[PDB]
DNA sequence: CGCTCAATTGGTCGTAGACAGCTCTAGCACCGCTTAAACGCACGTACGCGCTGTCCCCCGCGTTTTAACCGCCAAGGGGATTACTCCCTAGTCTCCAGGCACGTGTCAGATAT
């Protein structure tokens, strides 16, 4: 891949999933994962 | 009375902005197909208030010759243009900052599974 490893936030994330998914990930690192806590989220 | 001169209108180079074919997505009302409502085209059937020539005087028109006026002649002097002089605010672009909307929050206290 041309640039390694870029940095998001969940505001983010939920809106443009429809732009990240055009690349492919080896790992996904997740930091401060209690924002995940509601599974009943939209996130 | 047709030149020389001081300036554009128009021509060639430039550079990146503003298109229009992708390159698909996926949301949706268009197209298909029966179901079903009710009135459109059909249409008698009542009988008419636009037009056809009598009788008689009204309005428009031609003619006439005054005399006001528009088209025109030239000049009058002050205010719009052509151009220089200088002062400011329109646009750039910036950061500040806040209303509308969306979303997680959460757990409480009002309601029901």
Redesign the pocket.
Known sequence: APFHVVITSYQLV?QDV?YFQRVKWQYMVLDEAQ?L??SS???
């Open positions: 939920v429809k924002a806590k509601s989220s939209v996130r």
